[PDB]
């Protein structure tokens, strides 16, 4: 008897056991194999890492050291893929991307 | 005596301290992150449930999660997520 939770055995930080419990209680299938929460926790951890790193870079080019939802909106809306995933998603207190159409500028 | 709420705010902070050691996060941004992780979880899990139901199978395996990631996520995002899931499953079934 011991240690070694399933996240540490898979080298992750997202909980494999909680994801397995949510997959079991979420009424998705009759059975859940014990590789599906590992894959699922890995995918969620990768997506969280990508969004958090892009938002940290957006905060870093803002002379800031704390991520606000504006930085998350700037991270998501500046990417083709990410915007596509979260294209029908509203972020609270995120604002919009700063853009003006070129015909509105004076000349 | 009221019951406790659970979220991803502890693990998301761990991933943040991996990818950015000297960078904090506000509570509103943590709420955005929790909503994001929940939304992607429901999307992938529902997609994989539909994949298992179409093929007359009764279990969700890592193959169903891989196909759901391929269907849901766009190109290079899906490629790197498949890479991460494959590496984690290979690492998990070795100990």
């Amino acid at each position: 008897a011991k240690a070694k939770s399933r996240s540490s055995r898979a080298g992750l930080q997202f909980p494999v056991g909680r994801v397995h419990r949510l997959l079991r209680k979420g009424n998705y299938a009759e059975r859940v194999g014990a590789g599906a929460p590992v894959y699922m926790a890995a995918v969620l951890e990768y997506l969280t890492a990508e969004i958090l790193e892009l938002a940290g870079n957006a905060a870093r080019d803002n002379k800031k050291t704390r991520i606000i939802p504006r930085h998350l909106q700037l991270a998501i809306r500046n990417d083709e893929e990410l915007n596509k995933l979260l294209g029908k998603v509203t972020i609270a207190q995120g604002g919009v991307l700063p853009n003006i159409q070129a015909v509105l500028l004076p000349k | 005596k009221r019951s406790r709420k659970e979220s991803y705010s502890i693990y998301v902070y761990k991933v943040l301290k991996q990818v950015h050691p000297d960078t904090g996060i506000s509570s509103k941004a943590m709420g955005i992150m929790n909503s994001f992780v929940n939304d992607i979880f429901e999307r992938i899990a529902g997609e994989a449930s539909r994949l298992a139901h179409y093929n007359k199978r009764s279990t969700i395996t890592s193959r169903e999660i891989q196909t759901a990631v391929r269907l849901l996520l766009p190109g290079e995002l899906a490629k790197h997520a498949v890479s991460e899931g494959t590496k984690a499953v290979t690492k998990y079934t070795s100990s």
Epitope: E50, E53, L54, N78, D79, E80, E81, L97 | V19, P74, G75, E76, L77, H80
Partner: single-chain antibody, 226 residues
């Protein structure tokens, strides 16, 4: 499938400007950044900049700001580079390279390289050149200056040819690369291992970081067979 078409060699007198196109085909053009690097005999490969056609977002090297400008044409699926005020040390091979907006991804596909002829993290590679037989094991070290969280890539370049991507994310194999090449290491210490060689491994090998804002290439290791 993915092609990065370019122009021929441009002989240019000093003082004027020069244009280089990067007509791209085989993929969704707006979803991938186009990055420009230059190569000289004197100092090797160095990263000039990039242009993201999704929002036309540019980012240049600090030593190439003003010297080089980048534009994109979405209708023709082309990326244009302007170099202005060509001095004497501007005769170089200019490469454009596809790279995804994902941080893990690297310069996977390259252009042919336009030869222009005019009338910070330090990369330390310990072996400058080495010789090997037809079946032994080669190890190339790429100790870096600062900390990069596994954001290192390994490239193979034939003479008078575009560089070929071997390793991305410091351990992962590129598309079509066999399992003889193996990347290893993390943090500051990285290495590339060739398991058993062929006659096609006579090439120059480079390591590139993209963890920081200015991307820096390696010094280059020449590998000559028998």
């Amino acid at each position: 499938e993915v092609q990065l078409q370019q122009s021929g060699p441009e002989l240019v007198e000093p003082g004027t400007s020069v244009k280089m196109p990067c007509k791209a085909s085989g993929y969704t053009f707006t979803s991938y950044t186009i990055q420009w690097v230059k190569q000289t005999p004197r100092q090797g490969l160095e990263w000039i900049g990039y242009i993201y056609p999704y929002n036309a977002g540019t980012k240049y090297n600090e030593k190439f700001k003003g010297k080089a400008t980048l534009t994109s044409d979405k209708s023709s699926s082309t990326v244009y580079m302007e170099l202005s005020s060509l001095t004497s040390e501007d005769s170089a091979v200019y490469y454009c390279a596809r790279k995804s907006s994902r941080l893990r991804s690297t310069l996977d596909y390259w252009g042919q390289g336009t030869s222009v002829t005019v009338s910070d993290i330090k990369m330390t590679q310990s072996p400058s050149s080495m010789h090997a037989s037809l079946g032994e094991r080669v190890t190339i070290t790429c100790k870096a200056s600062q900390d990069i969280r596994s954001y290192l890539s390994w490239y193979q370049q034939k003479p008078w040819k575009s560089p070929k991507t071997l390793i991305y994310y410091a351990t992962s194999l590129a598309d079509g690369v066999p399992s003889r090449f193996s990347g290893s290491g993390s943090g500051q210490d990285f290495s590339l291992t060739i398991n058993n060689l062929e006659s096609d491994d006579t090439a120059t090998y480079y390591c590139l970081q993209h963890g920081e804002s200015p991307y820096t290439f390696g010094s280059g290791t020449k590998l000559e067979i028998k």
